[PDB]
Swiss-Prot record, chain B:
UniProt modification remark: 4'-phosphopantetheine is transferred from CoA to a specific serine of the Acyl carrier domain by the C-terminal PPT domain. This modification is essential for activity because fatty acids are bound in thioester linkage to the sulfhydryl of the prosthetic group.
Name by which UniProt lists this protein: Fatty acid synthase subunit alpha
Naturally occurring in which organism (per UniProt): Saccharomyces cerevisiae (strain ATCC 204508 / S288c)
Disulfide bonds: none
Name of the gene this protein is made from: FAS2
SUBUNIT field: [Alpha(6)beta(6)] hexamers of two multifunctional subunits (alpha and beta).
Length: 48, 97, 97, 97, 48
């Protein structure tokens, strides 16, 4: 009875929300610790 | 109605194979995922609340109006599952919505 | 395919122009300039190819008044009017509708 | 011809990630970020909305490289006409025109 | 010239506003050492 999994948090933190909004190429990655898909500062506004 | 919409969105993503809605953000920007669904009449239960239960002084939540909007279902979908900052366009078309 | 031929000709023209610009610019900051301009030219070439594909594959009928929206939507994928085999009727069970 | 004009005059920035939608819309007509001289704010006269909207406009202006000392002049129309629950953006559009 | 809509993020407040429409200014600045020719109007008219 857990088909609906409410997200407790957005994929970006409050401090990184603006950066994610302003970067069109920002994409989520799997966090090694939490294991969930989240935005990473290293991946935001990166030449890669 | 919002519960039905949440279940339908989850099941639609399951049918799409997207078990985690954030998997979309690996491929598109958060601004590139929209929700353009809507209702002909919206939260009629919340409308009945605000128009009749409040008139009768029955216990009604102070946010029954935000629960009554037609775009409230899409808002709850986005802010329980999607987290997208993409286009949101809630239509009304009666039976053709 | 004629448009793709023209697009590749345009791409190699712009590449030779970028090569001349790279010859002009000092070699100290040449790598970043080349990377930025190569990405720009790749984006432009992709945009031009998708524009040609939209013109000849998707929206070939938007301008033609002899092709209906329905017929054009069918013919985008090689189908014809006769290939529209099923019609999900509104079917409200009312006389007028 | 209209496809070429769309590619090079209207939608030249849809593909380029280095051009924002706002900057591209301005530059379609030769304008720049600094040419956006007026901002019809929502201006609901509520703490959260006004602070959030001022922050949003400020962040747009920062990211789009607006010149320092060139603030956008904010127009608050709901001080006079009040806040309608959907005619608001239309009244602000009329005022902006 | 432009018209766009946006949502904010995951939360539990319908009337709470957010920075969702900040995506209309989303831009990538990892490599901006040189101006894009695509943003120059003379270049675009040449292509046209």
């Amino acid at each position: 009875n857990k088909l609906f999994v409410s997200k407790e948090h957005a994929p970006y933190t409050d401090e990184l929300e603006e950066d994610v909004y302003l970067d069109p190429l920002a994409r989520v990655s799997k966090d090694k610790k939490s294991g969930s898909l989240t935005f990473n500062s290293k991946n935001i506004q990166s030449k890669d | 109605i919002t519960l039905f919409v949440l279940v339908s969105v989850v099941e639609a993503f399951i049918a799409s194979g997207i078990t985690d809605p954030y998997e979309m953000y690996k491929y598109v920007h958060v601004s590139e995922v929209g929700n353009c669904s809507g209702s002909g009449m919206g939260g009629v239960s919340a409308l009945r609340g605000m128009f009749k239960d409040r008139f009768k002084d029955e216990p009604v939540q102070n946010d029954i109006l935000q629960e009554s909007f037609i775009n409230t279902m899409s808002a709850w979908v986005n802010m329980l599952l999607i987290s997208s900052s993409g286009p949101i366009k809630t239509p009304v078309g009666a039976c053709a919505t | 395919v004629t448009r793709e031929a023209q697009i590749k000709d345009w791409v190699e023209n712009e590449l030779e122009a970028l090569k001349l610009e790279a010859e002009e610019i000092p070699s100290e900051d040449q790598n970043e300039f080349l990377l930025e301009r190569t990405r720009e030219i790749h984006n432009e070439a992709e945009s031009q190819l998708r524009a040609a594909q939209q013109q000849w594959g998707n929206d070939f009928y938007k301008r033609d008044p002899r092709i209906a929206p329905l017929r054009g939507a069918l013919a985008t994928y090689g189908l014809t009017i006769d290939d529209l085999g099923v019609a999900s009727f509104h079917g409200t069970s009312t006389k007028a509708n | 011809l209209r496809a070429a004009q769309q590619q090079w005059g209207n939608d030249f920035y849809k593909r380029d990630p280095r051009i924002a939608p706002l900057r591209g819309a301005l530059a379609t007509y030769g304008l720049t970020i600094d040419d956006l001289g007026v901002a019809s704010f929502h201006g609901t006269s509520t703490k959260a909305n006004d602070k959030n909207e001022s922050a949003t406009i400020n962040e747009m202006m920062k990211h789009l490289g607006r010149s320092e000392g060139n603030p956008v002049i904010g127009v608050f129309q709901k001080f006079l006409t009040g806040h309608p629950k959907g005619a608001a953006g239309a009244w602000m559009m009329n005022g902006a025109l | 010239a432009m018209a766009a809509t946006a949502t904010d993020k995951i939360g539990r407040s319908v009337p709470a506003p957010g920075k969702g429409i900040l995506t209309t200014a989303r831009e990538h600045h990892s490599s901006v050492k040189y101006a894009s020719p695509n943003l120059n109007m003379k270049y675009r008219k040449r292509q046209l």
